[PDB]
Amino acid sequence: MNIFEMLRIDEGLRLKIYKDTEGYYTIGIGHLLTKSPSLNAAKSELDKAIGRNCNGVITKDEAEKLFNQDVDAAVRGILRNAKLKPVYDSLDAVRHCALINMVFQMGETGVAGFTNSLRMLQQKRWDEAAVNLAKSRWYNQTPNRAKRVITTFRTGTWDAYKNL
Ligand SMILES: [Cl-]
Ligand SMILES: [Cl-]
Ligand SMILES: [K+]
Ligand code: NA
């Protein structure tokens, strides 16, 4: 397991524009295109991202290219965020992946709003952090995925993903 395998499980792979769990146009391996309700706006974003006129459809290689960009950018962003970098630096490489997963799903601002959970993680109060992470819109709206991420933070193992 690694971050790519983890997020591939959590996000799936679809080569045609689809709506994510929030109803937003997405493609590939959880590549959010736009929050606009306009399919045409989403198609435009897609073409801009790929560099060709895609008409809503991409190849696996193109999906993987966007996915690597999105992970790379998630990590670079964590490291530039004063609210996230200290907790990230305090963690082991498996728990890094849990934090990158959250940022991938909800964006930096959203994760930086988990102030109390992040403190408990920094403190290595793992069971307490796990309880606190679950007190969230995130856990209510995507409980199975949140449980996997939270187990990863709680245990520092891949137990929630090894078997999928
Ligand atoms: Cl709640
Ligand atoms: Cl879920
Ligand atoms: K295709
Ligand atoms: Na998805």
Structure-token pair, residue 7: 């997020």
> How far apart are the C-alpha atoms of 160 and 39, rounded to whole Å?
35
Phi then psi dihedrals of residue 32, to 5 deg: -65, 130
Cα–Cα nearest to 145, from 1, 6, 3, 4: 6
> How far apart are the C-alpha atoms of 138 and 107, rounded to whole Å?
12
Which residue out of 5, 10, 20, 89 is catalytically annotated? 20
CB atoms within 10 A of CB 92: 9
Residues whose Cβ atom is located within 5 A of ion ligand 3: 15
Torsion of the alpha carbons at 86, 89, 93 and 94, rounded to the nearest 10? -20
Q: Which domains are delineated in the chain?
A: 1-164 (1.10.530.40)
> How far apart are the C-alpha atoms of 12 and 104, rounded to whole Å?
13
Residue 18, beta-bridge partner list: 26
Known catalytic membership, residue 92 = no
DSSP 57: B
Resolution (in Å) of the shown entry? 1.1
Known catalytic membership, residue 11 = yes
Structure determined by: X-ray
Distances (CA, A) of 8 to 32, 43, 130, 144, 150: 14, 23, 23, 15, 17
